[PDB]
Amino acid sequence: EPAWQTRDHLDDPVIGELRNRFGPDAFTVQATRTGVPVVWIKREQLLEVGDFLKKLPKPYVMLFDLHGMDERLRTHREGLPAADFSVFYHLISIDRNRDIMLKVALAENDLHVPTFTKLFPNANWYERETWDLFGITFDGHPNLRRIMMPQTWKGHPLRKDYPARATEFSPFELTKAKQDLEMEALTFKPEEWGMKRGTNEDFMFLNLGPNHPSAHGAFRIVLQLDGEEIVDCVPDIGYHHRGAEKMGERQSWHSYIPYTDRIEYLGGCVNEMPYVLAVEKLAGITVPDRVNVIRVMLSELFRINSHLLYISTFIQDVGAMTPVFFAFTDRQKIYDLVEAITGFRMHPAWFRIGGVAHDLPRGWDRLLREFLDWMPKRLASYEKAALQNTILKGRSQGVAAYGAKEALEWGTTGAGLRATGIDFDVRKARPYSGYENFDFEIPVGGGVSDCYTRVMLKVEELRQSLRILEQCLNNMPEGPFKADHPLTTPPPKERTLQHIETLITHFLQVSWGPVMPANESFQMIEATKGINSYYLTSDGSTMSYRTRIRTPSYAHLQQIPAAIRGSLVSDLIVYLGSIDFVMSDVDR
Amino acid sequence: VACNLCAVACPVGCISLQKAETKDGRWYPEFFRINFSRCIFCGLCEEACPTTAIQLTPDFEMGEYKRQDLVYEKEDLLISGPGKYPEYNFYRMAGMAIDGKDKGEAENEAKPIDVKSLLP
Amino acid sequence: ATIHVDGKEYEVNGADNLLEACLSLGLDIPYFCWHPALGSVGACRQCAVKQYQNAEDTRGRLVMSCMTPASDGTFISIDDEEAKQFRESVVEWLMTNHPHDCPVCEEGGNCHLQDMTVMTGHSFRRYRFTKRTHRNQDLGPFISHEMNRCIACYRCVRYYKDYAGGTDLGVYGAHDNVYFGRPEDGTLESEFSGNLVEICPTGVFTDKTHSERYNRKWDMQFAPSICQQCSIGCNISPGERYGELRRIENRYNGTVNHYFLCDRGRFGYGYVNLKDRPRQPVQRRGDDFITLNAEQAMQGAADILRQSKKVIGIGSPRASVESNFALRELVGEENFYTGIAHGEQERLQLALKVLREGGIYTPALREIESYDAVLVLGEDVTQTGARVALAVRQAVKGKAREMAAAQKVADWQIAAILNIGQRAKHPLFVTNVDDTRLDDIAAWTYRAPVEDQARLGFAIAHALDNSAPAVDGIEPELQSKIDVIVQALAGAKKPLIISGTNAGSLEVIQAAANVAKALKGRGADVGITMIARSVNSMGLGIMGGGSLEEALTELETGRADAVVVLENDLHRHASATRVNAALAKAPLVMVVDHQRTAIMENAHLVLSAASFAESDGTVINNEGRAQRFFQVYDPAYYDSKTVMLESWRWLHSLHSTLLSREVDWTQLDHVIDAVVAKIPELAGIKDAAPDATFRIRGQKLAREPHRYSGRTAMRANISVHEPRQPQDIDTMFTFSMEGNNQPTAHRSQVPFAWAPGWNSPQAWNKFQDEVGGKLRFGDPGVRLFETSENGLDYFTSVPARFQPQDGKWRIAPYYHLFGSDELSQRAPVFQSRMPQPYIKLNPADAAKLGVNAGTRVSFSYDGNTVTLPVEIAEGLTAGQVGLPMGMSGIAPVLAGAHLEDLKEA
Amino acid sequence: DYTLTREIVTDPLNVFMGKLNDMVNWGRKNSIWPYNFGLSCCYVEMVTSFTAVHDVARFGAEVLRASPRQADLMVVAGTCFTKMAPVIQRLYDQMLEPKWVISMGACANSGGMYDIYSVVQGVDKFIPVDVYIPGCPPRPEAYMQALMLLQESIGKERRPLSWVVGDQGVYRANMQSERERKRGERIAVTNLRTPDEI
Ligand code: SF4
Ligand code: SF4
Ligand code: SF4
Ligand code: SF4
Ligand code: SF4
Ligand code: SF4
Ligand code: FES
Ligand SMILES: [Ca+2]
Structure with a gap:
């Protein structure tokens, strides 16, 4: 059997462990060429499945990836659950040297998933990007705001009905965003960025961007300082989003x-x-x-x-x-x-x-x-x-x-x-x-x-x-x-x-x-x-x-x-x- | 031969051309323009060319004052020789008849046998 | 029937072969020699699959899936290793002699052979010997010939000879020197020869008109449109590049014109690319011309029309339902006039009354092929409604189909069906003033004047039913032939009566209606077909309005001072001197048109209307089906100075600027709702297409393929800054790649066929529910009227016999496929196909006047004498003179008219 | 030929005033201080030009400034993302006269390969550009060539000598395009080295 052959990975021990824990009808195994087992989980069992994977004898310790998918234009969905959208979770067990991809199916109007941030903290930015580009709501997220696009963006660019090409340039929108930039320094609200205790009357707020004189790129970090000590820092990224x-x-x-x-x-x-x-x-x-x-x-x-x-x-x-x-x-x-x-x-x-x-x-x-x-x-x-x-x-x-x-x-x-x-x-x-x-x-x-x-x-x-x-x-x-x-x-x-x-x-x-x-x-x-x-x-x-x-x-x-x-x-x-x-x- | 493979192979879409035909039937580009303000010099057009017409050459000094002057038409692109491929000729391979090459004169081509020939 | 393909169970039709059943299921089997419309012959051997005897069989046997019935409990494998090897070997054998031609071949990117070479996975050449070559033939102005690229799949000869009935194409030679073409150089004589460019899977037969301005398929911008060149309503895909209409492809409609166009529709598009087209509104001041933008044209025209006392309108059967309705709204219904003549209008309304009040079903064009006896009265169908003639040819072959079905022969095994039905055919009886192209298959051809054809029809009706009016004075030989026709029609299980307005006689239409009523009264399943003249003749007849002569009298008496003329060359429907007088007298002539017509020198205002490529609208075919055509490209994209709007947009903006002094252009759906609210008989045009808010999962329908190239360079010579994408607020299509063209998308309007791995016209297989059937979610277009519960009464006005008169030459129409439709004559490629205008004479009349063949004779009509050279016509009866209708100087209104002082020049 | 800003005009240029204006232009063209601004990969090739193996300091154009007030040349080297476009506009506005702009790379020139929802199609949508460099990225010597082209453009321009005396209009020479200048030698090329060797 070649290394690129389609496999269901039913001989993976994690499939048997999930069978024993949740039953055989609780999920659907999809045969792919990803090289990892792909399991379609119900939305209401996602947190239990994630906690069970985290508590395995050789556990799945890292959330490698978390993102979304618009399935509405996918013609070949044989052996797949009915889904207008889906969310996938790629998890890595280092000790097993194995991966698993969980997939949650979603209807077009019921576009909300429980948050994964209590199990894996990198799900914060991953779910913010999934909400930004697909419009999928994550219930229980601390600050579910746009991370790639600006906050006053309309639509979700990775949806299939969103047009990819650049829109017609308007200097009016540029001047409006410039006014936003020059007013943000005066009307900063330290609650919309997930920050807390917005001036103890000692926390000085600094900005490092949005232009950086370095080869790693230009980006903005908002620093909350007590003297010289960083007590809180939230990044602003997406300034180099190329689609x-x-x-x-x-x-x-x-x-x-x-x-x-x-x-x-x-x-x-x-x-x-x-x-x-x-x-x-x-x-x-x-x-x-x-x-x-x-x-x-x-x-x-x-x-x-x-x-x-x-x-x-x-x-x-x-x-x-x-x-x-x-x-x-x-x-x-x-x-x-x-x-x-x-x-x-x-x-x-x-x-x-x-x-x-x-x-x-x-x-x-x-x-x-x-x-x-x-x-x-x-x-x-x-x-x-x-x-x-x-x-x-x-x-x-x-x-x-x-x-x-x-x-x-x-x-x-x-x-x-x-x-x-x-x-x-x-x-x-x-x-x-x-x-x-x-x-x-x-x-x-x-x-x-x-x-x-x-x-x-x-x-x-x-x-x-x-x-x-x-x-x-x-x-x-x-x-x-x-x-x-x-x-x-x-x-x-x-x-x-x-x-x-x-x-x-x-x-x-x-x-x-x-x-x-x-x-x-x-x-x-x-x-x-x-x-x-x-x-x-x-x-x-x-x-x-x-x-x-x-x-x-x-x-x-x-x-x-x-x-x-x-x-x-x-x-x-x-x-x-x-x-x-x-x-x-x-x-x- | 204005086959338009380089234009569709261009990921930026900065090649535009139109096919014309000579009296003897030889295809050629009526125009050929490349927007070099868009071109990323990726070489996919040269890779896609089945005649070795379009080539990327060792020349980097293309700086310009006006962006409209980075639109290079056919008079700015066609050079006096074969470039990096000194001998290849697509029309020596094609079965389409042009001036100086009738039917059956291309490489690995037999002479045409008319259906009224006496041989079985 | 139950079949098992590669271990998967499928339910199929047991009357289908395995290839069509598997292609209907979405499976991919390579094929060359099979076509859905032509049946199976098993020549190319490309479609090989492995058939097993039962489920517990492992050896199997290679069979051709096109020649194997999809019977119950069949077991086949497509992906079997031996079958894949054999299919790759067949591709390799075809590739041994194939020339190194793809860059300089017009089929590249649209080539079925390229697609099947890739599909079989054959990419390595081990053949090292010489390739056979062939000399090419000149095939006329439309089809270019390159026999080096032939794979000897026999599709061309099967279509051209067995399907289309053509006689000048064939296969010659022997073993590997098989040559497909004509016996000598010359133009292909078939009216349906243009379908060879899609039938041929290689680049042997190519569109030469496209080849002059060639571009690849991925570079085209397509739209689903309707052919404008006659009344049939064949669905087309116009494709453009760099602002010019480049090609007309067939757009599959399982109810109308399924795989095939006629050559007029396919090649008569070149008027759109004419350089003398109006691009912007022009107003004449004195002897000079000034160019206005659209706002100034609206303000000035509204001011002048407001100053006038009465504005009248002259529509056109060229123009869509929306534009004619907008004209009728701008000038008022009582001041609206149809642009056609009084007799033409009377014949058109009689045909419409027969169609929607005669109580007899009118079949669609695809449905014509199922009728087992055809009577054509007066209508030269091949030259006026050619696709109906193709369908009638198929209906004639229905008898061989029936005899083959009696012997338990499968309906796809076409060679066996042709062998069984050697020359037996269903009865075809055509009547004309002369010989027609249907005479090679017609059981009888009646060459007689139009009143004599009507008398034959009334006699047939009276011999079918004694309640029908009788015809007195029938010769015994004509009576015997009438009895032959009556015995053929009475014993038919499904008779079809075809007539139309092109014959120029009301009594021919009445006789056709009486024959249809007599067949209906005997309990037969009779259908009736009418052939109109132009693309929206039936829509103008349904809308109604006064004749062109009434508008001319209004403009000549002077009580109307402003006239709007929409898409109308008025010399086709009236005498040129009277039109010129009435337009020179009129203080305001406004002409909204897309072609440089002859009444634009006396036009005070000229509005640059859009042609069908640059406009959206609805047209009514002669079947009664409303069909929506969509804009192909934005004319202002490449040349920003072009002000070329939809005609209904112009007229609605004019009405708005007249009423509220404000310029509002419109949206298309607002005009559609206005049509269906004011005119209840056109309420079906709402459902012809979904509105502009229609989406496929939130996204619009794409007009151009996914690999559309040159988007940052095609306008870079004008400016390096890319313009905005054009916005389509009119329809659900977008002017871009950012849209949907999936074959599984829930829609009926398909701009072009493409599927991954199927780049040729064979992707229409993927766009169908079953191959050769209908589109997956139904064919577009809806019928405006249903069959009436009650029919008409018998028309008792039987015309008298034709008597020749001395000095009075009755004009017999001689329509031409290349030349009788105005816009197609304007196409420059039709000038090479243009026949020389010859006036047809009887041998007796020419001998009486002392003129041989080729001599010039001058005749006087409307006080003007014109000279034409004589051609001797044996079939044309005495007292008639034959004239080519619609040509330069000979209007179609001259059909059925008399003529005075025909003298030798 | 010249272009006026405050219109296509002629050359306005006493014999002492012309020589001293030439000395002003010579000092401006031999002392160009670029602004430190990292957008994308083109900036990596720009700072490659700053290093020892290329030594753009030889032209006097190595003084990289973190403050736009002390920088005369803005090198837009990278993609003009929609979030970064107001930042680029503000940084350009913060610079002082005379200020010059070099677009480096296809992204800055036209948007390049990113005709996408989040990218402004070229920095000349909102900022005037004096020298364009094609490439993705342009090599460091192409940046040096654009620097020399900028020096030729600077040495032929006429600017107000003082804000209290004389004409205050800015005159920019309408130079010949480099394409038409090099068309004589580029078309005459016949044979190039085959790609099989090194
Ligand atoms: S090298 Fe330039 S022109 Fe050629 S394919 Fe790449 S981007 Fe297009
Ligand atoms: S340059 Fe090459 S690929 Fe491009 S159109 Fe010409 S022959 Fe074809
Ligand atoms: S017919 Fe098809 S395979 Fe043959 S040269 Fe043309 S494009 Fe290539
Ligand atoms: S000319 Fe075309 S259709 Fe005819 S046999 Fe050859 S490949 Fe087939
Ligand atoms: S039959 Fe009529 S509608 Fe059809 S393609 Fe021919 S001209 Fe067009
Ligand atoms: S032009 Fe190319 S190298 Fe330069 S910033 Fe854009 S992607 Fe990077
Ligand atoms: S398609 Fe079956 S043998 Fe040709
Ligand atoms: Ca439109």
Whole structure:
């Protein structure tokens, strides 16, 4: 049985446990290509099912994802409960190394679900986004307000009857929103943001945005301060919302790849990898080994690029300015190799459904050798010049620390979760793209996720990525760069240029689009900043019926108030520098 | 050959063209315009081109004073040579007859046999 | 019947084959040579499935699903590995000789062969040898020919010969050199040859008129519209790109015109793209012209009309029900006049009275094919109502269908049905002034003057029932042929009587009504069909109004000083000199029209009306069915200076500016409600389509496909800033991709057929309840009137025999499919198809006047002499002269008229 | 040719006043202080241009300001989201004369690939732009090229020397388009390197 085959996962022990606890008629198991068991739960049993999953012997500890779905235009709903809308809950058991996707069906007029925030606190922002984009009410939510769109927005953009395209620009609305911006500083009400005790006559209120002079993006945080101590902080996000999921419903499976590039814009091919893997699951494509090695090498090069940017930006946030110049020189070496291979620097859009766009150019190994000889001396110099400086250690050590429980309850992934001591990397736990054929280590922390611990873990991850690149350079299969599947999009170019069957396939694939049979697919990867996942629903057409992107920066930004309360503002800047987020990843 | 595959493959939709035909039957673009203020330089049009006509070249210096001047018509795009693919000719492959290539003169094509031929 | 496909149980019709049953169930089986309208022949071998003997069978056998009945307890597998391998191999065999042509082939993106190549999953070529090639033929102005792309599926010859009755297409040659085409270069002679471009699954036969301004299907903007070129009401999908009407595709209507158009509807759209069309309101000051915007035109026209003493209106059967009603509201009902002549109006109201008071059911166009005897009286159906002639051909083949059904032969096995019914056919009796295109299948053809055709009809009615009035002076040979017709019609289980207003005689319509009444009185299931002239002739007849001659007398006596003329070239319905005099005398002439007509030089105001591509409205076909057509594109999108509004919008805004001095344009549903409130006989046009608030789960219906390209570059030469999307407050369609076109959407109006994996016209399979049946939620359009409980009385006014008169030449009409409909003559591609105007003479009359074939003769009509060259017509009886109606200078009102001083030039 | 703002006019430009206006323009064009404003990925390539491997400091345009009062050039490098558009407008209004605008990338130019419900289709919907850079992202040397184009535009413009003496109108040179200027050399290109090699 291939790894992309449709499965019901009835042999998962959690299905038997749910059978024993709630009975056999309490839920409906759906066969998908997501790789996880998908269970349709009644709305009135959702909290009991969630608590039961949380109290298992090897429990489901993390709410990985929570979002909605407009099911009104879905023609192929065979074996599914009747639903105008639905809400899905992706939960991860680390100890079992397993997931489960709960789905609640909803009628068009009865669009309310009990809140999940008492079980998992990251459900706050997830349910705010579900209410914002789908209009689904969550009963019991502390502050159910719009998080992506402005508060005075009409409609819900991810509904199927909402038009995707930009409306006609009016300067009157711009001047009205400017007046809103200049009056908000005078008419601030600290109850509509979920805040309490709105002036003790000592709480000073500051704003950090909505413009930030940094590479992670521009965003606003409202700070409630007692002297220099943060007693409350609520973020304002959605300032970089690009409608990427709605655009996923508008582009074909092939033409959406450049949009996947710009989710986490320091990631590139790393961002492309989960999307093309999920589409290949929908298409039933098993890529050859050379494709796996090529995609792994590109992803590791972009991971080194992103980590160099993160370490240099953290050092600049501490107060040392020269390592960012040197790290950008190293980024230029990486960009030389990436430009040679893909023809682009930052958004290569080079991965394809079933492979990559072109073969590797002649002489790529010389550039890889030059980079692999250039990097380690520079990394050691960076450590000795900035990372071992006691001023940086005093700025970083002990600042915004959390343990394993706080990381699990907020959906924290990546270097923060591993800095809490939990050894969970996607490339080892749920291997993808031939990562099992590479010998590399996963660095973990001692149990405390500090700013310094996260930065040093990212340094060791950079060294491990250099090891993976060395193994990629020494071991390359001499095979195809595209799979021989009929749904490989586009087909190989020379056969397109001289064979009529291949020309026909290319013609229909680039114009109407490749036809993906109706299914649901899922793929999570270890991105540069945590776990990035694509959840794709095909209704049998040439475009996605639903593209859901889970990004780790959303979860880390939601974890910000739990870890920074009672600290200084300078500690908040250091924490923002040590998270490794970008606002495009947050808002999508 | 104004086949319009690059325009539909463009995710931004910044390619517009119209097919015209010569006297001998050769397809060509009557016009061809690319809005470079919209273009994201993703290369999907070059990938989709079945004739290797449209190509992305190593030239980054495209800065402009007026945004209307970033609309490049056919006179601003058509160059004097083959570019990155020096030998490919789609019309040597196509069965459609043009000037200088009658029926049966394309690659891997036999001469036409008329139905009134005496051979069985 | 119970079938089991891939382990799933299904209930199907046992009289269907497996391919049509499985395609009706939503399953995907590739196919080439089968068509729903043509039956099964088993040529292409693409539709192979694996049939098992029973449930406990594992080997199976590959069968063709199109040639295998969907009998009870059938067991088949589509996704069997051997069946999939064989279907891929069939695609591969078709691909060995296929040219490398998709970029320069007009079928690309709309190609059934491309779709089935992708559907079978065949994308790797291992064939390395040479490809066979073919020379192409010239097939005329409409169809381009490219035989390299042929897959030898035989669909073209089966449709053209077996279905459409054409004779100049065929298959030639042998084994892999099979060639599909004509015996030599020449124009395809069939009136229904244009359906080849959708019948052919490859790019062999292509729309040449589209090919001149080619664009791909995904780049089109479509709308569900009605063909304007005659009264049949065939549903069409006009598709546009860059502001110009690019193509007319067939839009499936299971009740009207299911898969097929005629060539007039398909290729006679080119008048919309004419450069001399009015784009904006123009007002003449002295000898100069000034261009106004819509507000200034409304203010000035309202002021001048308010100053006038009496405003009269002249509608048109071209224009929709809403626009004619808006004219009738603006000028008043008593001051409203129909734009057609007095005799034309009398024949039209008599046809309407027979249709909605004759007590005899009038069948739809699809229902015509089930009648087992046809009598056509006077109406040259092929040249005036061509799709009715196609349906009558199918009804004639009904006899072979009956004899095959007697021998327990399945209704889809078309070759066996044709073999059993060799040349036996249901009786067709056509009457005309000359030979018709239906004569090759007609049991009898009566070439006689229109009064003699009426006398034949009255004699048939009297021989069917003695209460009908008798005809005295019938020759014994004509009496024997009348007895043949009467014996054929009396023994028929379902006789059909077809007539129309094109014959130009009231007594022909009365004779048809008397035959229908006589057949009704004997308990037969008789149907009656009337053929009107133009797209909304029946709507203008239902609305009513005075004739054009009454309006001309009003404008000539001077008691009417302002005239509004809507969508009307007045020279078609009246003499040109009288019209020019009455319009030069009138101090105010306002013309609302979308074409540069000849009365726009004497027009003081000209309003740029929209054509059917740029307007919404309702038209009534000759069956009595109200059908809504929708706007295709916004004319102001590319050229913002274009002020081209709906005619009812113009006239409603004029009435509002006249009354309240304020400019309110309107909404379409308000005009619909106004029509159904003032006119109760047009109350059915409310239900023809849902209103503009109709939604499919909250979203509108899309006009363009999902992959519509160039949205940030198609106007970038004008300005790099993208304009706003056009807003459609009139209908439920949106002018964008942001809409719904799902095949399962609960609607009846479908702008275009597309499904994932089905990019060709075969996606109409997905848009149907069963393949070849109706649309899934019903065909659009509703009948205005039901069958009356009581019929009429026998018309006792039997006309006398035609006597020739010396110096008096009775004009016999000779209609043409290419040339007798005004807007289609305006299309530039119809000039190549335009026959040279020849005046038809009897050999005896031409010998008496001493003129041979090809000589120019001059005749005087309305005090004006015109010269036409002579063609000898044997069938035209003496005392008649044959003229081509509707041509340049020969109005259709001349049919049935006399002529004076026909002399050799 | 020139464009007047306070109209297409001619060149208004004594021989000392012209030389000293040229010295004013030279000082303005050789001292350009960009504003620090991070919108999206285009800003990452902009700060890549600021780094050592490119060294845009050579042109004197490295002085990055967190205050719009001390910044002469606004580089809109990123998508103009609907929530960020009033912020961009306020930051532009906070700048002082003379102020110049460079749109960097397809998002700032036209909206780019995001013709979506939450994105303003180009920053020139509400803010005047002097130099546009196509690309997604433009490479750092393209940003430097746009900087040189801005210097050529600045060196050919006429601004009020003082607010109390002389004409107070702002004159902007209607320069030739770069497309028509480079059409001579771009069309003459015949052969490029094949993509198989490096
Ligand atoms: S490179 Fe530019 S023109 Fe070509 S497909 Fe991409 S966005 Fe469109
Ligand atoms: S550039 Fe290529 S893809 Fe585009 S229309 Fe021309 S031949 Fe077709
Ligand atoms: S007929 Fe179809 S497969 Fe053949 S060249 Fe044309 S588009 Fe391609
Ligand atoms: S010309 Fe077309 S319809 Fe006729 S046999 Fe060939 S492919 Fe079939
Ligand atoms: S029969 Fe009449 S309505 Fe139908 S396509 Fe022909 S002209 Fe149009
Ligand atoms: S133009 Fe491209 S690189 Fe620049 S901000 Fe937009 S998505 Fe990012
Ligand atoms: S469709 Fe059945 S053999 Fe052709
Ligand atoms: Ca309209």
